Amino acid sequence: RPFTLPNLPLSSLSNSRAPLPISSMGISPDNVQSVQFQNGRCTLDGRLVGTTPVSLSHVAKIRGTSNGTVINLTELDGTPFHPFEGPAPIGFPDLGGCDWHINMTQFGHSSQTQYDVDTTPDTFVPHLGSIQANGIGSGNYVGVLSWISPPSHPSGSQVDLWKIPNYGSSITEATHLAPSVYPPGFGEVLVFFMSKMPGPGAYNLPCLLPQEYISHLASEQAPTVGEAALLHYVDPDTGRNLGEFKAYPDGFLTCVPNASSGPQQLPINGVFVFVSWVSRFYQLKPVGT
């Protein structure tokens, strides 16, 4: 089973941390040395990691029963969540450095309710299947992340979507986190797929893989033949190669920026195409060259 990526332009694909269209590629700020996203994580041979689901219909969603004080969580289909499986139910939002505003609906009832989530207090323990209701009345709900705002705590914090929330309690740590992802070095930096997030600011949500890449990899389960997959970002209309990238087994892409000539300067309507398997230290040409 040869390795492939979907033959679809990036700008028609979805973020994997929220049901949002991809509008650009980007890199992390210099002071972001690593990420540990829990959604949008899938190895190149198709193993889902963290809380990543196959389908965008699960992404950035919660389900549980409120009693007025806490919401006791389940998986999105209603089956029980067990802490040893991950840091939260599958698809649970993983946006750190922000308050969440989740749109709550119910099967069999009329109306939608906004659920405002501060992810810092000792009642926010999704790893134990329990988060504060914050005024959400009793009942069973499905919620989807709708918009974000600056964290309520610490006061004065900015929105910072390079973070993940604290999933554990003030005493017990969330287990089975997806591992961190680091830049490979020697010029290669992580490539992120960006989406505009509604909220009272110019919020941009980064993710490591488009959601459609994830369900493709989960379906294909192509054996990871080499240490890295050399790819071309090609123009769909001409086939012209716009730059070399590497995809790594843990499930992320890199390039060598030279800079106002990084992946953000490339068009967003291009297609990633697998070229061959290469060594970890295969030296990429700089973007633009």
């Epitope: 810092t120 207090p121 009642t123 705590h153 004065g156 003030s170």
Partner: antibody
């Protein structure tokens, strides 16, 4: 240690500007809040400013009629209250709390001014 | 906003007896990251600005007589005057400084019972 300006009488609909001066050390290491207290009532936080970062915030009910400012050269914070009504008759307190960064000022109140009485009446 | 609720509204306790004042916050003020409760207690006598008694829920402010103590965690907090003295007649307020806006309880008036 927080020195407030004198009592004021204002007619309904007018505006009042109340000052709070402190030492320069306190001014550049603290957030300066304004807390008011209607006669025989509780304490109501109106808003605050961190002078060295020039960031402000306000409680929802005082948004639009209240502005809080700071003068770095005189170490003085100001509270301006427009569209005054009778229910705005209160003692307006200046209060400080530690502020190490723009996102690191979640601290209990440090000092209090002696208060400034604002009587709104005809 | 985090709403602070105190109980009782007023308290009358005989000299040398213990006064307890409860405070509940509508949302936990216990930051998981540092394990601190962002809660303070103040004393206000008429004509005066409030005075800090307790901070971080249980830490006694320097100069406060040690018959003042604070306890509780998360959403439920308690101020206790273990042996009330005449100079403690005042209004007591709890306050969260976890988030903006800062909010106080409605206050609890403590008088000497006779």
């Amino acid at each position: 240690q927080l020195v407030q300006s004198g009592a004021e009488v204002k007619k309904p609909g007018s505006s009042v500007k109340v000052s709070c001066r402190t030492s320069g050390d306190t001014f550049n290491t603290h957030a300066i809040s304004w807390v008011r207290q209607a006669p025989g009532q509780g304490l109501e936080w109106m808003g605050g400013i961190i002078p060295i970062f020039a960031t402000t915030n306000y409680a929802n009910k005082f948004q639009g009629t209240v502005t809080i400012s700071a003068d770095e050269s005189t170490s003085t914070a100001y509270l301006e209250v427009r569209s005054l009504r009778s229910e705005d008759t209160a003692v307006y307190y200046c209060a400080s709390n530690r502020a190490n960064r723009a996102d690191d000022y979640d601290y209990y109140f440090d000092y209090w001014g002696q208060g400034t009485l604002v009587t709104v009446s005809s | 906003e985090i709403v602070m609720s105190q109980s009782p509204d007023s308290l009358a306790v005989s000299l040398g007896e213990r006064a307890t004042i409860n405070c509940k916050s509508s949302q936990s003020v216990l930051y998981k990251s540092d394990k601190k409760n962002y809660l303070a207690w103040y004393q206000q006598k008429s004509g005066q600005p409030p005075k800090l008694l307790i901070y971080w829920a249980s830490t006694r402010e320097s100069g406060v007589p040690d018959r003042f103590s604070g306890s509780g965690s998360g959403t439920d907090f308690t101020l206790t005057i273990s042996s009330l003295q005449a100079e403690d007649v005042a209004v007591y307020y709890c306050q969260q400084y976890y988030s903006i806006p800062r909010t106080f309880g409605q206050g609890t008036k403590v008088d000497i019972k006779r």
